[PDB]
Design a protein around this ligand. Structure first.
Ligand SMILES: Nc1ncnc2c1ncn2[C@@H]1O[C@H](COP(=O)(O)OP(=O)(O)O)[C@@H](O)[C@H]1O
Ligand SMILES: Nc1ncnc2c1ncn2[C@@H]1O[C@H](COP(=O)(O)OP(=O)(O)O)[C@@H](O)[C@H]1O
Ligand SMILES: Nc1ncnc2c1ncn2[C@@H]1O[C@H](COP(=O)(O)OP(=O)(O)O)[C@@H](O)[C@H]1O
Lengths: 735, 496
């Protein structure tokens, strides 16, 4: 038994002496809330930390940060021994000194700038011989214990004096640098990063297991994403956290060699990593190495591609090397590389969402000190087209602005800077706004994927439609047991038709938010570009991106916008079928029905929609969104007024009754006009900060009905023709 | 390995990775080495990457390698007993000079295995490990209908890796070698396979899949007149050809199906392939339209070639008029009723071998816009009209559609058929689909019973929509009577 062995895993808190344990873990080992333990690992070394309460990690695993993982020489997946230590122990004299690998540039006091704001009111239990890292001064510097009283009996106390000599010491090869790349340095990538964690955990941490079994290990991992997403960061972090010898192979570095030298350089890079097993061979750019799809210009290019292909599939076990290649675009790769044995496991790393970029900002700003009025929530929202490298550049530029506001008048003309100035240099929002306005996003044209923040509370009315949407996309994904028993497959998608500006997009986004799945949206111009551009082959890429991002919903806005541009029911001498809808149907028919992917079709002119899409099998479920009723319009305003401060004066119920033929869009622009009037009257009166009732009274003058009465009749007759519930309404069984 | 011949593997990129002139020596030395060890088999991994001399023609070394391969290929004037077997991905991606008589004449096409084929692959790849009692490979093959042989091996490996992850974490056998008393007890369950099945991306989705469909005559409701006619033109010449050559007249080349949509135009074609035990190739409307909108009509030849060497097989064209509907119809634009895709289809059908067992099935729902040039005796002369199901034809439809979902004796199927007068085959399917969806919804809602009750169909019958109205019924009937034209000669008799 020996219930003291726990699985080491990454922590969540950014502190130093923190251990995250579940309630039953301390309840089994008679451990309390505010106690200390003694973690013991390999190489005859121990560590003293503080246990904390957790409820998310696991049942029998320990969450330990990178700062303390390097102290015990224990990586992820290894096992350690934990035991309580209720013995009283105080600190008297702690002597520490940093290592010269990171102190080059520090001048002045070292206690007041790094130790005082870290050791006081913390009661961090230090251990003689441990390496702890502290952050501050827009950098990261650690410290090393060289001589102290024999451990245990080392706990920082307010009445403990600290003195240091001043010169640093050199480190050894036993410990790794804390400034390197780790799992805690990656943000905005959780679904993709977890797959890579679980994919290479066995062959790297346990190389001897695969040598004794017939299981084929994954020999190739291809990474996607626009340049700057962080593929190299993830590749280096996996190697640095799994104990594998990382070997970086740059793209242009090999191609820059002469004729025949590139072959030797690429070939010598494989056995070198094979000897240092386990190892990870990473390729920076692979589209620039083997673009053997359309280029095929030059014998040396093909020779390099063939050499790479030969060295790729020729890894018949031997060592335990895993090759992870990175590229920019999936189609820009040689198809011969995707053969089974060279590159079979495929990983797509997308642009982080709003909740992902905040983690990147927290990672990139953890070394510097910010002011109280600095919030990263608005920065992530305002930066919705940027990538991982974009935000690091934004942070660097924002940090540079603060230096410019103090270097000019202080004029520290010294060979090295002091640590007592940079700590006080707090970056404010004004520094970030200057850099945000000039940073050009590198990721704007390709489709962005989210899991939208809009929920059911933002949608007013449409209660009949909500239950229907929560009936076909949430039941097969949560309770499939009642589906395979009957032997019938679920629906492939549902089409939305009705008057424009009623919520055709809000329902699709809310159903994605509730189901916790990705959301891909295609607008009208996006569909029209591939028609006018005479290139309909881009549907396959959209469907592939949706498939491997499962679960996800495939939303097509105004699907009839391609038939409206060429007439409609009659139009020109052609019919109601074109190349883009052709390719969409072709890719939907061959789409995997067992996957969690879903397709949402939105249209405002259902009379011109091709019937070929509407058969049972592609899009059979049709839900009509009518105009909001009296109590449906009230909820629209109750949901739209949650952002702007409006007092109790405005009567929303009375406004809904007068707005009879008003769609959802009109009620939004009414509030927009009222708030614009409020802003205008505030600015004009500045030469008050609340929305009054006469604002809406004047804004109601220009209340234009976007939907007239002529199309209402057409929509209603179309709905009743497609429903056809008459005749069989009184159909009953005799006995 | 089973014939006792010395196998010599020649990789594609391995030869191309050599320098200028070294690849020639490496390829040449690989022939006499196998010749001395006769008998031997010389296998080429990738041949499209060695001799793509069809459009590439870039570089003197590439052409030199192709010419060296061609010279060493046809230069094997007996001598040894070596047989060269080359492998490639796509038939058109090969140099036509290699297909000359003497180098590569025998041609083998290996297709994607069907449902009954993938089960054997799973049994082969799982015979070394131990599975649990609740592990069945029948559903895995059905759920994996776009995967290939290597895909299923990868799926099995990934499923086996999941089981190890659930035990290595807590056991922690930190040893240089594993013990045999642990892996035997590590039984892989269905939960391990389902995780790997959901993330495995099939590599074979766009090219046409070939089967020998599992649907039989018991699944088709009614249409007894049509079954005997189908079993009359495709099963007699293939089983009893002795009475065909004696009369000196060739059998028919194909039969066209016309009628209202959703009546069984595909079920009959699949059942006639199942009964005859032959391959089935299906082409949908969008597949035909892609080669029209893409301005590339040359892909008909590949489809016909794939059908020919997969004999016996049936060539099924779904909604053949879907290409005329996209451009108008009877009048449409300033053009007529003939386009490039139908042009190529006719060109390849006229030159098709009449002695082969291949067959062509044409399906259409707007026969008025079908080009008469296809309809002459010689290409598509047999026409069979599928009318709306009658009273006793609709009962069998439900009796065949209810074989999958558990339904008690309560629901009266005979009474439902009489009220559904103007209902096609498709409407009766969606009625049952709605009823079963209601049953699933009421089971899930009541969970917070496992049988289909009678009020399920009673409520599902409210939204019974007739996909075929009355206006097109008259047009279909008048078209059928115009094409039949059996009047006038009904009382034609011989005097003596
Ligand atoms: N998801 C991320 N989390 C944290 N930092 C990131 C992320 N993505 C990129 N970065 C930062 O951007 C910098 C540049 O990354 P880069 O080398 O361009 O990645 P790639 O090679 O994948 O394009 C790195 O120093 C890294 O710190
Ligand atoms: N039912 C509704 N409840 C609340 N707001 C709505 C509703 N329908 C539309 N809106 C508002 O109208 C705006 C534009 O909607 P739009 O995308 O044009 O709808 P649709 O996709 O149906 O045309 C959205 O920002 C949304 O906030
Ligand atoms: N005669 C029939 N008997 C039983 N089921 C039928 C019949 N006709 C059609 N169906 C059902 O309708 C569904 C769709 O048929 P479909 O392919 O649209 O027919 P068609 O090719 O004639 O248009 C099929 O899944 C099939 O089960």
């Amino acid at each position: 038994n020996r219930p003291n062995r726990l699985i080491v895993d990454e922590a969540i808190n950014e502190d130093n002496s923190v251990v995250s344990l579940s309630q039953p873990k301390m309840d089994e080992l008679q451990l309390f809330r505010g106690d200390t333990v003694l973690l013991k690992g390999k190489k005859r070394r121990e560590a003293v930390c503080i246990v904390l309460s957790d409820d998310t990690c696991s049942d029998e695993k320990i969450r330990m940060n990178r700062v303390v993982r390097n102290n015990l020489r224990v990586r992820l997946g290894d096992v350690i021994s934990i035991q309580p230590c209720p013995d009283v122990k105080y600190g008297k004299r702690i002597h520490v000194l940093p290592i010269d690998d990171t102190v080059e540039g520090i001048t002045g006091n070292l206690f007041e700038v790094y130790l005082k704001p870290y050791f006081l009111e913390a009661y961090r239990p230090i251990r003689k011989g441990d390496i702890f890292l502290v952050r501050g001064g827009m950098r990261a510097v650690e410290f090393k214990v060289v001589e102290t009283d024999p451990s245990p009996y080392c706990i920082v106390a307010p009445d403990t004096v600290i003195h240091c000599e001043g010169e640093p010491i050199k480190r050894e090869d036993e410990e790794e640098s804390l400034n390197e790349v780790g799992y805690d340095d990656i943000g905005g990538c959780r679904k993709q990063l977890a797959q890579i964690k679980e994919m290479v955990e066995l062959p790297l941490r346990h190389p001897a297991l695969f040598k004794a079994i017939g299981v084929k290990p994954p020999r190739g991992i291809l990474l996607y994403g626009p340049p700057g997403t962080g593929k190299t960061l993830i590749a280096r972090a996996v190697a640095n956290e799994t104990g594998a010898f990382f070997f970086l192979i740059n793209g242009p570095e090999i191609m820059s060699k002469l004729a025949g030298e590139s072959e030797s350089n690429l070939r010598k890079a494989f056995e070198e990593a094979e000897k240092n097993a386990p190892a990870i061979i990473f390729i920076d750019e692979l589209d620039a190495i083997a673009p053997k799809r359309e280029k095929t210009h030059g014998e040396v290019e093909r020779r390099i591609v063939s050499q790479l292909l030969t060295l790729m599939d020729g890894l018949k076990q031997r060592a335990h090397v895993i090759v992870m290649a990175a590229t920019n675009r999936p189609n820009s790769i040689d198809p011969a590389l995707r053969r089974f044995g060279r590159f079979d496991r495929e990983v797509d790393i997308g642009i982080p969402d709003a909740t992902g970029r905040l983690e990147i900002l927290q990672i990139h700003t953890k070394n510097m000190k910010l002011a109280d009025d600095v919030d990263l929530e608005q920065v992530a929202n305002e930066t919705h087209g940027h990538v991982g490298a974009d935000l690091a550049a934004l942070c660097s530029e924002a940090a540079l602005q603060a230096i410019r506001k103090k270097m000019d008048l202080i004029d520290l003309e010294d060979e090295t800077i002091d640590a007592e100035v940079m700590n006080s240099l707090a970056v404010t929002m004004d520094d970030f706004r200057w850099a945000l306005s000039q940073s050009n996003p590198s990721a704007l044209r390709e489709t962005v994927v989210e899991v939208p923040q809009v929920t059911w509370e933002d949608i007013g009315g449409l209660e009949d439609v909500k239950r229907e949407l929560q009936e076909l996309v949430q039941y097969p994904v949560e309770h499939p047991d009642k589906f395979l028993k009957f032997g019938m497959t679920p629906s492939k998608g549902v089409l939305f038709y009705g008057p424009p500006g009623c919520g055709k997009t809000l329902l699709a986004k809310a159903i994605a938010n509730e189901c916790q799945a990705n959301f891909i949206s295609i607008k009208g111009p996006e569909l029209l570009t591939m028609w006018f551009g005479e290139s309909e082959a881009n549907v396959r890429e959209i469907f592939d991106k949706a498939r491997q991002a499962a679960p996800c919903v495939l939303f097509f806005d105004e699907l009839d916008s391609i038939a409206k541009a060429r007439g409609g029911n009659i139009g020109n001498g052609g019919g109601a079928a074109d190349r883009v809808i052709n390719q969409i149907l072709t890719e939907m028919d061959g789409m995997s029905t067992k996957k969690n992917v879903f397709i949402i079709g939105a249209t405002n002119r259902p009379d011109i929609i091709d019937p070929a899409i509407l058969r049972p099998g592609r899009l059979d479920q049709l839900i009509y969104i009518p105009l909001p009723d009296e109590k449906s319009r009230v909820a629209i305003l109750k949901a739209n007024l949650r952002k702007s401060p409006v007092a109790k004066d405005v009567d929303l119920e009375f406004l809904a009754k007068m707005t009879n033929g008003f769609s959802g869009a009109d009620l939004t622009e009414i509030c927009q006009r009222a708030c614009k009037l409020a802003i205008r009257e505030s600015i004009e009166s500045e030469i008050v900060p609340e929305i009054r009732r006469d604002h809406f009274e004047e804004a109601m003058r220009f209340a234009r009905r976007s939907v007239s009465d002529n199309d209402i009749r057409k929509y209603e007759m179309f709905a009743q023709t497609l429903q056809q519930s008459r005749g069989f309404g009184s159909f009953r069984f005799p006995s």
